């Protein structure tokens, strides 16, 4: 029953709520479909006759890229640690767009050994991500909006993307 209609607002002057229509089918402000982590669940929603939106209610893995060589595998999720526009969204652990979520990127390491053949100090990458392949808790954002895609996509953070975000972590 949420409204997305434009006539509900006040004018640039601030006109006093002229009350022309009530709600119709066309301005159907849908519910906020906040997700969480867990076993994958899909809702199919029919809008505009033939457009099938995909509501992601629970999701467990994602396709996250690493831009320095341009590759992306399937990684199991761990948990969100920061979101820019909200803070209780993190405590809820609901994955929206641009949320900074932990993963255990073991097949990223397995690809790294299958492409280079050298252990990670237990052609090169900068030192601040060597702090947590030993921890095995790699940070990644969310690229796609999961509420209509029915998919979880992101990229691993790269260079200054850490150096601005652990600054915002602490």
């Amino acid at each position: 029953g949420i409204s997305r209609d434009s006539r509900h607002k006040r004018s640039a002057t601030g006109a006093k709520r002229a009350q022309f229509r009530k709600k119709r089918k066309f301005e159907l402000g849908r519910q906020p479909a906040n997700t969480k982590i867990g076993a994958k669940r899909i809702h199919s929603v029919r809008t505009r006759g033939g457009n099938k939106k995909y509501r992601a209610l629970r999701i467990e893995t994602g396709n996250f890229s690493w831009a320095s060589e341009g590759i992306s595998k399937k990684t199991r999720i761990a948990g969100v640690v920061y979101h820019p526009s909200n803070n209780e969204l993190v405590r809820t652990n609901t994955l929206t767009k641009a949320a900074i979520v932990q993963i255990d990127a073991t097949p990223f390491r397995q690809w790294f050994e299958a492409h280079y053949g050298q252990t990670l100090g237990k052609a090169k990458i900068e030192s601040s991500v060597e702090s947590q392949f030993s921890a095995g808790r790699l940070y990644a954002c969310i690229s796609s909006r999961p509420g209509q895609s029915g998919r979880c996509d992101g990229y691993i953070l790269e260079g200054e993307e850490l150096a601005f975000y652990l600054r915002r972590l602490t």
Partner: peptide
């Protein structure tokens, strides 16, 4: 939570007494 729902069930009538949508979860 598939959609935000509120739901009434009656043990004297053993089924869905009432279902209504709501705004958020």
């Amino acid at each position: 939570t598939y959609k935000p729902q509120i739901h009434v069930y009656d043990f004297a009538n053993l089924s869905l007494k009432f279902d209504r949508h709501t705004d958020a979860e």
